[PDB]
Amino acid sequence: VSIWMHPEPTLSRDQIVRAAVKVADTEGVEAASMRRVAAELGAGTMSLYYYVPTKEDLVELMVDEVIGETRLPDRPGPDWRAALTLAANEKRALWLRHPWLATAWRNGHPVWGPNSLRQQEFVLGTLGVFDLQVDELLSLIGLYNGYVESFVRNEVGWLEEARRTKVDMREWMRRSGPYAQQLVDSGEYPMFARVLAETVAPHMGPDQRFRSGLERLLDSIGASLD
Amino acid sequence: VSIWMHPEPAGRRSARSHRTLSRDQIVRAAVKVADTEGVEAASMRRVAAELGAGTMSLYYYVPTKEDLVELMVDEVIGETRLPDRPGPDWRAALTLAANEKRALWLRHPWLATAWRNGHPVWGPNSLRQQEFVLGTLGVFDLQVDELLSLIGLYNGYVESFVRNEVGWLEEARRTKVDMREWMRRSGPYAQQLVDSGEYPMFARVLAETVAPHMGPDQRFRSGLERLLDSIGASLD
DNA sequence: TTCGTACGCCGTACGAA
DNA sequence: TTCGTACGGCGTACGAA
C-alpha cells in the first residue's frame, strides 16, 4: 500500500527527493513536475519512476525529507511547556521555509516515515509522563497540532499567493479597501466592520501573535492535566 | 482586483427570452460535478459539457478557474442552516456553527483542497457565516485582537479536525482504499516499527490510532467541548 | 536500469462566427 | 456573445535498448 513499505530497488530515490525539494522551494511545488525534476538531475523523465512509483508518492517522500531538517533534542525534558513551544516554533520555521507543505500534504493517512516518526515521538513524549488515557493524550495533542498547523497554514497561504499572483497581503488589503468600504456601509455586516482595521493591518505581528495563542493553548492543556 | 469586485457582464437590453448560461448557473454545475465525481473532475471542459455549453463560453462569465473555485466555495457555504442572531448561549451558538461547518465539509470534501487559505473569501455567504461566529463573542468586553485570537483558536480546532476527516474520505475516493483498509495493510510495517524499539510512544498509541475507542462524532464533540471550556476561562 | 515516444488530460490565448 | 482550434504543460503506460 504505502511507500515506507516499498523500498527502492548517481540516480537514486534519495537523490530524486532532494532535487524535488530544491525545485519546490526555489520555484514552488507546481514547478516540481516529473520532467522538471528529471531535467534537474540530468535524467530522463521516466527514469525517475524506477525509484518512485507515483508522483503522489514522491510528495510524501518530499514531506518526510524536509521534516528531517528539524533541530530537536532526543528527550523532551521535564518542561513540557518549553518542549512543546520549541517543537511548535521549529514546525513554523519549517513550514515558512517550505510553503508547499500546506498544499502538498493531502491530510489522509499519517506519514510514517522516519523523520515524522522521530518528530512525533518528541511531541507525544512531552505528555507521556502524565497519567492519562491513550485517547485523552491524542485529543490534547490534536488540540496542540491544530493550533500550530492552522496558524501556520494561513501564514504560508499568503506567502504562496504572493508568489503566484505577485500581490502580497498589504497590497491585497489595499486594493480591497473600496469593496470593504461598500461592505461596511451596506450596514449588513457590523462585526466585519468592527474587526476590519485589525484584519487589514494587525496591532502585533506574526511572531508575537503566534506566541500569544500558543501560550493560551498551553495554559488550557495545563488545566486539563489537573 | 478579486471576484467580488468583478461582476458578470450585463445582458443586452431586450424584452425577449434570457439565455440560460450565467455565472450562477456555471458555479452551481461545477459544485454538482465536484460533489458527484470530485474536484479534479470539475474542469472547464467537464463543467461546460454538463451545461451543454462550449468550453471557452464559460470564460465570458468567469475570468479564471481559480476564480470559479472561490465562487464555488462561497456558494456551498450558503447551505449553512443558521439562526439570524446567535443568542446568549455562546457555547450553544459556537457548537451549532461548528457542527454545521463539519456537516458542510463532509458533504463537500473538496473544500479542504479547494480553499488555498491566503486571502479571506469576502462573498456574501462567508460574510454572513462569519458575522454569526464573530457575533457570539461580540457581546463580551474584549479587544478586537483578543476576539480574533479566540475565534482563531476555535476555527483552528474545527478546520484541522475536519480537514483530516475529509482527507481520509477523499483518499478513499481516489484510491478505493478506506481507513480501516489502510490501517489493515500497514499493520506489518507498524509491527516492524513497534519492534524496532526506536518508537515507544508510537507503539503506546497504535491500538487507538488503528481503531479508535470512540468514533468521529463523539471525538469531535469532546475536543470542541474542551476548546470551548478554555475560551470560557479566557472570558473570565 | 534507462529513457523516447505517445495518449489523454488540463487551463486558457486568440480570433472569427 | 459564443466557442473551435491550438499551444504548452501535466502524469504516466508502454516498449525498446
Could you please describe the fold and organization of this structure?
Two copies of one chain form a homodimer. With 226 residues, chain A is mainly α. Chain A has two domains: 1-66, Homeodomain-like (Arc Repressor Mutant, subunit A, Orthogonal Bundle), CATH 1.10.10.60; 67-226, Tetracycline Repressor, domain 2, CATH 1.10.357.10. The first copy, chain A, contains eleven helices and no strands. The first copy, chain A, has helices at residues 13-27, 34-41, 55-67, 80-97, 100-104, 114-126, 134-165, 169-186, 190-194, 196-200, 206-225. The longest helix of chain A has 32 residues, at 134-165. The interface between A and B is large, with 68 and 69 residues. The structure holds a DNA duplex (17 and 17 nucleotides). It is classed as protein-dna complex.
Descriptors:
homodimer, 226 residues, mainly alpha, Arc Repressor Mutant, subunit A, Tetracycline Repressor, domain 2, DNA-binding, calcium (chain B), DNA-binding transcription factor activity (chain B), HTH-type_TetR-like_transc_reg (chain B), metal-binding (chain B)
